Amino acid sequence: LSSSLKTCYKYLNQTSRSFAAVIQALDGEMRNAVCIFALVLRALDTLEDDMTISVEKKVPLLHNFHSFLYQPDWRFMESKEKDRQVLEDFPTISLEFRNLAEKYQTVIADICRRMGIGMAEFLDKHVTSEQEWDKYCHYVAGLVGIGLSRLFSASEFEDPLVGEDTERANSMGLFLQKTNIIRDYLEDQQGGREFWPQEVWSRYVKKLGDFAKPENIDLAVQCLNELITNALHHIPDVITYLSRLRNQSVFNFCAIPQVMAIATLAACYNNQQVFKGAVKIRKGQAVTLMMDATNMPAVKAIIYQYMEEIYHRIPDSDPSSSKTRQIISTIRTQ
Length: 334
Ligand SMILES: CC(C)=CCC/C(C)=C\CC/C(C)=C\[C@@H]1[C@@H](COP(=O)(O)OP(=O)(O)O)[C@]1(C)CC/C=C(\C)CCC=C(C)C
Ligand SMILES: [Mn+2]
Ligand SMILES: [Mn+2]
Ligand SMILES: [Mn+2]
Hints:
By secondary structure, the chain is mainly α. The chain has a single domain (about 1-334), classed as Farnesyl Diphosphate Synthase (Orthogonal Bundle). It has helices spanning about 5-15, 15-25, 30-50, 55-70, 85-90, 90-100, 100-120, 130-155, 160-165, 165-185, 185-190, 200, 215-230, 235-245, 250-270, 285-290, 295-310, 320-330. The chain binds the ligand CC(C)=CCC/C(C)=C\CC/C(C)=C\[C@@H]1[C@@H](COP(=O)(O)OP(=O)(O)O)[C@]1(C)CC/C=C(\C)CCC=C(C)C and manganese (II) ion (3 copies). It is classed as transferase.
């Protein structure tokens, strides 16, 4: 490997810890392509997340980010985010980007372009409806699934269908992102960011921050269960998507994060502790189970086990209880 590509893998291990291992195991050309895609996405997210950058300054950066990939000299030296190194040494990443086959470059730049436009749109608004929640998730995560899928198809390790079924790929991304947002209530509230959809939480409290108040814990947990229930609706699509993958390394790459997210939602379900910080995800059980789960029947058994865990904890009085049971029964029979 070149020194620049070695550096890129260094950055991948620092900035995308949960994905680094499955990425490095990808077959052939997919490995570098996905590594670089992850790094450019990390840089773009680091811009989006940085609240020290004014909206006025941020908007052109997000819009023009895709074009920076083709400017050998471009870097950004003003980030105060923890992953700023990928911005400050962007030339190393964009160099390796321009080393990828054109077919991968085209997908990556297209997704960066579309993601930047969408991220910019949300700088001036909160998330209101459930549809707006889906829209925000599409821009920051669904498009990643779509991009990854198009990379798989372009590589020819997977069929054209994988890249073409953008709804299924979108769902894979939405599932991870909704899980992240649900899980990260308190961290986000403390950093002054709000992602829970207003049309949902405003049925419980007047301000999203009110869920951090001990007196409101029961309403907070109802809302939590409602949002989890919404996220579970993506699982049929995740099963459909995973069922089509032919290449082992791709399957592992796609399946592992989805199972980790499922385990996270199960740990979050009906759990007051979400409102007090990080929940013990029983990450370990999931990681251990996935070692052996290299095929659809094994993946399905794990999903069913986590769904059964949620199901037997559904409170009778929970306003979402009927819906939660309904989606779990759908998942079980897919
Ligand atoms: C390319 C690769 C492996 C990883 C990319 C991750 C990187 C480095 C940057 C992207 C940052 C953005 C914009 C969104 C979220 C990633 C975590 O960011 P984070 O900072 O925690 O969230 P936030 O800022 O909202 O708090 C996220 C969860 C996207 C996950 C979607 C996937 C993986 C598609 C699955 C679909 C199939 C596989 C069909
Ligand atoms: Mn972000
Ligand atoms: Mn982020
Ligand atoms: Mn988050």
